[PDB]
Design an enzyme around this catalytic site. Structure first.
Site, PDB file in Angstrom:
ATOM      1  N   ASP A 141      31.831  92.032  48.172  1.00  0.00           N
ATOM      2  CA  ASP A 141      30.710  92.597  49.085  1.00  0.00           C
ATOM      3  C   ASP A 141      30.666  92.000  50.355  1.00  0.00           C
ATOM      4  OD1 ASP A 141      28.196  93.497  49.998  1.00  0.00           O
ATOM      5  OD2 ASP A 141      27.151  92.839  48.280  1.00  0.00           O
ATOM      6  N   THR A 142      31.074  92.763  51.456  1.00  0.00           N
ATOM      7  CA  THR A 142      30.873  92.206  52.709  1.00  0.00           C
ATOM      8  C   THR A 142      29.465  92.425  53.393  1.00  0.00           C
ATOM      9  OG1 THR A 142      31.269  94.558  53.797  1.00  0.00           O
ATOM     10  CG2 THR A 142      33.200  93.176  53.488  1.00  0.00           C
ATOM     11  N   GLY A 143      28.490  92.850  52.765  1.00  0.00           N
ATOM     12  CA  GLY A 143      27.073  92.850  53.181  1.00  0.00           C
ATOM     13  C   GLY A 143      26.418  91.765  52.669  1.00  0.00           C
TER      14      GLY A 143
HETATM   15  C1  LIG Z   1      23.080  89.536  47.537  1.00  0.00           C
HETATM   16  C2  LIG Z   1      22.473  89.030  48.829  1.00  0.00           C
HETATM   17  C3  LIG Z   1      23.267  88.049  49.276  1.00  0.00           C
HETATM   18  C4  LIG Z   1      21.221  88.704  48.408  1.00  0.00           C
HETATM   19  N1  LIG Z   1      22.234  90.162  49.719  1.00  0.00           N
HETATM   20  C5  LIG Z   1      21.842  91.303  49.663  1.00  0.00           C
HETATM   21  O1  LIG Z   1      21.088  91.727  48.593  1.00  0.00           O
HETATM   22  C6  LIG Z   1      22.117  92.334  51.036  1.00  0.00           C
HETATM   23  C7  LIG Z   1      20.884  92.245  51.767  1.00  0.00           C
HETATM   24  C8  LIG Z   1      20.860  92.934  53.106  1.00  0.00           C
HETATM   25  C9  LIG Z   1      19.422  92.912  53.786  1.00  0.00           C
HETATM   26  C10 LIG Z   1      18.506  94.135  53.012  1.00  0.00           C
HETATM   27  C11 LIG Z   1      19.283  95.332  52.983  1.00  0.00           C
HETATM   28  C12 LIG Z   1      20.512  95.184  52.331  1.00  0.00           C
HETATM   29  C13 LIG Z   1      21.356  94.161  52.908  1.00  0.00           C
HETATM   30  C14 LIG Z   1      22.815  94.096  52.053  1.00  0.00           C
HETATM   31  N2  LIG Z   1      22.578  93.388  50.893  1.00  0.00           N
HETATM   32  C15 LIG Z   1      23.901  93.623  50.146  1.00  0.00           C
HETATM   33  C16 LIG Z   1      24.253  94.859  49.431  1.00  0.00           C
HETATM   34  O2  LIG Z   1      25.580  95.162  49.385  1.00  0.00           O
HETATM   35  C17 LIG Z   1      23.578  94.950  48.141  1.00  0.00           C
HETATM   36  C18 LIG Z   1      24.426  94.148  46.778  1.00  0.00           C
HETATM   37  C19 LIG Z   1      24.099  94.668  45.591  1.00  0.00           C
HETATM   38  C20 LIG Z   1      24.976  95.469  44.831  1.00  0.00           C
HETATM   39  C21 LIG Z   1      24.522  95.851  43.614  1.00  0.00           C
HETATM   40  C22 LIG Z   1      23.339  95.619  43.129  1.00  0.00           C
HETATM   41  C23 LIG Z   1      22.512  95.009  44.026  1.00  0.00           C
HETATM   42  C24 LIG Z   1      22.847  94.359  45.230  1.00  0.00           C
HETATM   43  N3  LIG Z   1      23.944  96.482  47.746  1.00  0.00           N
HETATM   44  C25 LIG Z   1      22.455  97.188  48.035  1.00  0.00           C
HETATM   45  O3  LIG Z   1      21.716  96.593  48.115  1.00  0.00           O
HETATM   46  C26 LIG Z   1      22.824  98.577  47.610  1.00  0.00           C
HETATM   47  C27 LIG Z   1      21.723  99.402  48.277  1.00  0.00           C
HETATM   48  C28 LIG Z   1      22.143 100.742  48.242  1.00  0.00           C
HETATM   49  N4  LIG Z   1      21.306 101.627  47.855  1.00  0.00           N
HETATM   50  O4  LIG Z   1      23.454 101.388  48.547  1.00  0.00           O
HETATM   51  N5  LIG Z   1      22.899  99.110  46.239  1.00  0.00           N
HETATM   52  C29 LIG Z   1      23.680  99.629  45.604  1.00  0.00           C
HETATM   53  O5  LIG Z   1      24.756  99.989  46.129  1.00  0.00           O
HETATM   54  C30 LIG Z   1      23.611  99.468  44.170  1.00  0.00           C
HETATM   55  C31 LIG Z   1      24.461  99.821  43.247  1.00  0.00           C
HETATM   56  C32 LIG Z   1      24.142  99.668  41.754  1.00  0.00           C
HETATM   57  C33 LIG Z   1      22.817  99.305  41.333  1.00  0.00           C
HETATM   58  C34 LIG Z   1      22.704  99.162  39.868  1.00  0.00           C
HETATM   59  C35 LIG Z   1      21.335  98.703  39.659  1.00  0.00           C
HETATM   60  C36 LIG Z   1      20.262  98.417  40.626  1.00  0.00           C
HETATM   61  C37 LIG Z   1      20.593  98.371  42.106  1.00  0.00           C
HETATM   62  C38 LIG Z   1      22.022  99.119  42.394  1.00  0.00           C
HETATM   63  N6  LIG Z   1      22.488  98.941  43.643  1.00  0.00           N
END
Ligand SMILES: CC(C)(C)NC(=O)[C@@H]1C[C@@H]2CCCC[C@@H]2CN1C[C@@H](O)[C@H](Cc1ccccc1)NC(=O)[C@H](CC(N)=O)NC(=O)c1ccc2ccccc2n1
Lengths: 99, 99
Positions: A25-27
């Site tokens: 995950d790059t974000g």
């Molecule tokens: C992990 C952590 C270091 C805390 N970082 C983050 O959470 C940061 C926070 C940043 C600020 C807020 C807005 C989002 C960005 C990017 N995210 C990273 C970001 O990559 C995050 C990682 C992730 C993947 C899967 C499940 C949960 C979390 N993905 C997401 O937030 C995206 C949002 C979306 N609808 O596309 N979620 C998903 O693509 C996704 C996929 C499967 C899932 C299954 C169950 C529950 C949730 C699920 N969410």
């Protein structure tokens, strides 16, 4: 290897004796694993994302093997749906974005 | 361009006549943008991340210019902290991961 994004960029990690699959995950600044058995000393930490915050256990200096590449870093363990390899570790295995 | 990951992978996007900064996110399935004025119809949707779920407005057929590359796709607008470009658009601008 080169990885296209039509499917989720999921790799095999070996961590603490255990084999898991994690999302490249790059974000994500941090690396967050789902609740597992890790040896040692950990601190309480809260991290945020979409939807809000979770409380995680911080372990530093953990060895991780991401798709056969070794790296040592801070790993957070807590209630995340999927195991995420974040940018603190992606820089160590030399991971770049291309377009 | 090639992007290393020591700093967050942010690019400039032009959407709805407006210039924004957004994060190239390989671990996001969808493109989520903070609250902004967009024209047309939208459908309600719930999406989840690490701290839970948010309610977003789904817009389809939206034109988005990401670092000079044009792409057409679904954009979700909502209470996200940072603008996120997820894999539904990154595959259209030819984005790959490398290590
Ligand atoms: C992990 C952590 C270091 C805390 N970082 C983050 O959470 C940061 C926070 C940043 C600020 C807020 C807005 C989002 C960005 C990017 N995210 C990273 C970001 O990559 C995050 C990682 C992730 C993947 C899967 C499940 C949960 C979390 N993905 C997401 O937030 C995206 C949002 C979306 N609808 O596309 N979620 C998903 O693509 C996704 C996929 C499967 C899932 C299954 C169950 C529950 C949730 C699920 N969410």
């Amino acid at each position: 290897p080169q990885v296209t994004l039509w499917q989720r960029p999921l790799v095999t990690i070996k961590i603490g004796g255990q084999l898991k699959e994690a999302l490249l995950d790059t974000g994500a600044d941090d690396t967050v694993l789902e609740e597992m058995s890790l040896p040692g000393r950990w601190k309480p930490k809260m991290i945020g994302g979409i939807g809000g915050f979770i409380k995680v256990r911080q372990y530093d200096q953990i060895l991780i093997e991401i798709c056969g590449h070794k790296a040592i870093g801070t790993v957070l363990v807590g209630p995340t749906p999927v195991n995420i390899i974040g940018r603190n570790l992606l820089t160590q295995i030399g991971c770049t974005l291309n377009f």
